[PDB]
Amino acid sequence: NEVGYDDIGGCRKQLAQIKEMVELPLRHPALFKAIGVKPPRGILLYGPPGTGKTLIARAVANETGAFFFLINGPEIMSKLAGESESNLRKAFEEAEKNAPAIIFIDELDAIAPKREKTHGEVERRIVSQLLTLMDGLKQRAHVIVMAATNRPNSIDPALRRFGRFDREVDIGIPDATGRLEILQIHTKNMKLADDVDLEQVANETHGHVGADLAALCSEAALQAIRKKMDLIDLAEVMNSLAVTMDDFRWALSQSNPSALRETVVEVPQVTWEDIGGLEDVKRELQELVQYPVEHPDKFLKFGMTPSKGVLFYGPPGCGKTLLAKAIANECQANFISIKGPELLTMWFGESEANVREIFDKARQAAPCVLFFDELDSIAKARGGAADRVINQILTEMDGMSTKKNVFIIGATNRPDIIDPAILRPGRLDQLIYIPLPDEKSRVAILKANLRKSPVAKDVDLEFLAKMTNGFSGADLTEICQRACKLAIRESIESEIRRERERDPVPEIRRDHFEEAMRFARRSVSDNDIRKYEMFAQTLQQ
Amino acid sequence: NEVGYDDIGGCRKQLAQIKEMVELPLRHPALFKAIGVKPPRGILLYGPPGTGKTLIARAVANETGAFFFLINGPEIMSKLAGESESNLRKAFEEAEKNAPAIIFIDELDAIAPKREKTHGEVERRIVSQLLTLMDGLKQRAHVIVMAATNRPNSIDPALRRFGRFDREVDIGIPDATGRLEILQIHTKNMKLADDVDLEQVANETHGHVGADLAALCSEAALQAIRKKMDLIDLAEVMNSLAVTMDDFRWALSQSNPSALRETVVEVPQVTWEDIGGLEDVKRELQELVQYPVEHPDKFLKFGMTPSKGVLFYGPPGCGKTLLAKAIANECQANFISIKGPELLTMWFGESEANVREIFDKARQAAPCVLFFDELDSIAKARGGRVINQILTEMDGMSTKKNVFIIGATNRPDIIDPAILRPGRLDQLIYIPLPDEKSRVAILKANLRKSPVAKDVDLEFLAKMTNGFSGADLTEICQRACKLAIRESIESEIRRERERDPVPEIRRDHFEEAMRFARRSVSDNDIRKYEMFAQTLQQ
C-alpha cells in the first residue's frame, strides 16, 4: 500500500466531498453519539468507468489507515454455484471483527444489475445476500462499504433503498485542470523535452479518462520508442527520455476516448468577456444563480422564492450558449448542457427515462445549470402538445425545490409553437429575449477571436464591426473562420515555393478580412425579427 | 428492545388507525367471540421506503407487549435453495407457540412481486409457502402478520385476496407538522443553538421522509463538525451542540429528496384567506364537500346522494387550485393533486394502469378531494385513453366514501361529451376571472409570509387592476420582489466596497412592475366562457 491523494486526483470537489464524508471513523470514534448516526452506511460511486475509482477508495483507506481489503466483484460471479456466497460473507465477517474497515466492491453491475438483468436464480440470491449482509451491518463498529457503478439506473434499486447505499458522490470526469493534474502525475514517471507545458494537451483533449490519459502518456513514450531505430539491447533511451509536443499531438490524433458523448458536468472557462451588452439582463442572470448561492440571507429576508431559470428565445446563435457557460463560470458552479439532438433522442428513439437521468445528474451535482437548446425542434418536427419530452421536463422541474438550486436555461428559435404551459407562473416563465448582438457584443466577439490566435497590426476589426451590424456574432465567428481559411490557404503555400525551389507570415491581414466579408451570408431575416419584437406588446394586465 | 410508542410519530391518523386495529390482542382476548372474527388477518403496509415502518411495528408491538420477531424478507432469499423454508415455517411456528405474536415482514417485494415477474419456480414456491402459512393461521390464538410493502400493485394480487393480507392502512409520507414531529424526535437526542424553532426548517422540506430527516439532523451536526478548525481528540466537539439555522438550510441545500415526484396526500395549509368572493359558489362548494361528511343524518333523510366532484373551467388561474386545497383544509380532509403533466404522461407514453392505483390511493385516503388540472391538454393534443379510465373509476365508486374529483379546464367544450351527463361530474362551474374582493385576498396572500411596513398602496394597484387577473398580479408581486431585492443588494454593497436591508417593497417598485404584465384572458375568450351562462329559463 503506497498510494496517495494526488495519483488519481484532479476531481478536487468530489474528492473533498468524500474526504469530508469518510473521515468520521478517522480520529473520531465516539463522535457518532454526538452526530446521532453516521451518514456513511454505504457509498455509491457512479460515473464513466475505469476513472480510478478503485484507486480513489484505496487512497481514502490509505489516508484513514483503515483495513481496505478490496473484493473483486465479478469474482463472486466467477465462483461456482452454491459457494458463490464465499469471499463475500467471509469478507464481511472479516470486516466485522476488523473495526476500521472501508469495504470497496467493484463492478456492482456484475453483482447487482437492473431487474430486467436479474434472470436466473443464483444472481438474485447473490444480490439478496449482499444487501442482507449490508443492513445486517447496521452500526457494527463503524464499517461502511463502497461500490463502483456505471449509473444508478443500471443497478438494482433495492440496494438503492435508503438506510443502505444512501451516499451518491458522482466522481465522473475531470476538467482541463484535473486532466492537467492527472497528466502531470502520470508524467512524473517520465521526462519530457519541455516543448509543451501539458496544459495545452489537457485543454486540447476532450472527454478522456485518467486511465485514458495514462494511455496517452504510454503512447507518447511508445512514440519515443518508435522514433529511434532498434538499439542493440540499449540504455541509451533510459537516460534520454525525450517525448515531444509532436509525440503528444500525434498521440491525441491516434487515441479514441471511451467517456466521449457522455454529458459533461463541470464548470467551463469563458470568464464573461465573450459577451457584451444587456447590462441589466446580464446582472439578472448573474444574480439569479449567484445570490441564491452567495447571499441566502437576502432571499431569507424576503421569502418569495425566485424562478429557477430562464428561456432565451431569439435568433439562432452561440451567444446564448456562451452566455450560459459564462454564467456558470462567474457563479463558479457546475454546468450540464443538453442540446437539440439529445432532446430529439427522447422523441426519436423513445427513452424517456433519460430526462429523469439528466435531472437526477443535475440534482446530484448541485449547484448546477441545465442548459437546454433547440426545444422547438420536437414541436416543429411535429408541425412539419409536449410529445414525451416537454411534459417530462415539466414533471422534473415541478419536483425541484430552490434548495439544490438546479438552473434551467432554455434556448429557442421560435417562441410561438414551443409550449403554452411554460408561459404560466409556477412553471419556468422568464421570456428573456436576447436580441441580435450589437456593436459592443461584436467587439467582445472580436476580443474572443484573439483567444488562441496570434494577433498583430493592420487588421481593421472596428471597420468590420461597424459594417456588420446585421451580421450576428455567431456569423461573425463564421466569417472569422472564413478569414482563417483564407489565411491557411496561403500561409504554408508561401513557403512551399521555397521547397519547390530547393517566412510563415503568421498573421491575418485586411485583404483576407475583405474577402471573408465578400463570401459569406447572414443568419437572420427581418420577418423573424418582427415576431421577435412581437413580445414588446407586453405592457399591461 | 428500547423503542417506545412515542419514539415514532408524524402519521397521527395512520398511527391512530393501526393502534385501533392491532389492539384486539391487547387486554381483550375474549372479545373475539363478541366480534365473531378478528378483523386483522394480515395488515398490509404500503408507502415509500425509509418511513420507519419497522420502527412503527416495533413500537406498536412494544405498546402491545407482544412477541414481535421481525424478519426481513430478502434474508429468506439469501438462504440456500430447498432449505429456504428456514425462517418461514420456523418463524410462523415460532409465532404459533406464542399467542401475542405480531409478525413483521420487511421488503415483501423482494419475496412476493407480481407473479409473472417471479421467473423460475423457487420464487413462487416461497410465495406459495408464505400464503399457505397465511391462511394456515386461521385464528390460531390471535396471531396476525404485518408486511412492509412498497406499493399495492407491486406485490402479487393473489396475496391481497380477502382472507389473507386484506387490511390496507396507507401509511404514506408525513405532512409538514408530521415532519416537525419527526424533527423534534431526531433533535430530542441532540441540541441546537435555538436560532430556529425547527418549524421554519420543517415547513418546506417537501418530499422528505424519516430517513431523509435523519440525514438532515445528521448532516447539520456534520456541518457543526465542519465548522471547527481542528480539535485534537478533545470534549469541545461534544459539549458545543450548537447547530444553526444556517447549518439546517445548508443541510436542506445538500438534501437529496427520496420520495419527491410522488402523489402527496397531506392536508393543505391554506385556511381560506387566499381566495375570497363568490359567495354562492363557496356556499355550494362547502355544502357539497363538508355536509356529506359532517352531516350524514341529513343525507340519510333523503336518498339523492350528490355528485362525487365538480368541474371548474374558465381562464387558467391558480385560484381554483388553491380553492380546491382550501376546501379540503376547511373540511380537514386529505388532498391529492393530479396535475396536467401527470395526466399527459399516461396518454402519450402508455402508463394507463396507474390510474387504477391513484384512485386506489384516493379510496384509501378517504375522506379526500382530488384536484385534476389541465384535462383539455390531452384533448387539445389530439390535433396537436387515460380519461376513459377516470370515467370508469368514479363510476366504480360508491355513493359514500368521498373522493371528490375537482377538474381544471381551459376550454369547457373540448373536454368530454360524457362528463356533463348526470351520474358523472355534471356540476359545471364557471370560476370566473378574479374580481376586486378576490384580488384583495390575492393581496392578502402577497403580504402573507412577507416583511411589511408603510409606503404601501396595494389598494391603488387593486383599482389599477380592476377587470384583470390575480395570478398575474401574483406574478406582479414576484416581479416587484425581484425589483426590490436587486436594489436591496446595492444598499449593503457600499459597506463592502468603501471598506440597512430596507425590508419593505416601495410603491415605485410596484408601479414599475405594473408595466411588465399582460392580459392572460381575452375578451372573446371571456365571451366563449360566458356563452355557457345560457342555462336559464326553459
Author numbering:
A (entry chain F): 199 to 432, 439 to 588, 596 to 713, 726 to 764
B (entry chain A): 199 to 432, 439 to 588, 599 to 713, 726 to 764
How did the manuscript describe this experimental structure?
Human p97/VCP (valosin-containing protein) belongs to the type II AAA+ (ATPase Associated with various cellular Activities) protein family, which has two AAA+ ATPase domains. p97 comprises an N-terminal domain (NTD), two ATPase domains, D1 and D2, containing conserved Walker A and B motifs, and an unstructured C-terminal tail. Six p97 monomers form a functional complex, featuring a double-ring structure based on the association of D1 and D2. IBMPFD/ALS is a genetic disorder caused by a single amino acid mutation on the p97 ATPase, promoting ATPase activity and cofactor dysregulation.
To analyze the activity of mutated p97, we first assembled an in vitro complex of full-length p97R155H with p47 in the absence of nucleotides (molar ratio of p97R155H hexamer:p47 monomer 1:10). We reconstructed the 3D density maps of the p97R155H dodecamer complex at 3.34 Å resolution and the p97R155H-p47 complex at 4.30 Å. Local resolution estimation showed that the density of the p97R155H dodecamer or the p97R155H-p47 complex is well resolved in D1 and D2 domains but not the NTDs. The densities of D1 and D2 rings were invariable across the reconstructions. In this complex assembling, we did not supply any nucleotides in the purification steps, and nucleotide was not detectable in the D1 and D2 nucleotide-binding sites of the p97R155H dodecamer or the p97R155H-p47 cryo-EM density maps. Four NTD densities could be assigned and shown in up configurations, and they are rendered into slightly different orientations in the azimuthal direction along the C6 pseudo-symmetrical axis. Only one p47UBX domain was found to fit into the density attached to the up NTD. Unlike the p97WT-p47 complex, the mutant NTD may be too disordered or mobile to present a structural feature with the p47 factor to be resolved by cryo-EM. Our structures also showed that the arginine fingers exhibit different conformations than those of the wild type when p97R155H binds to p47.
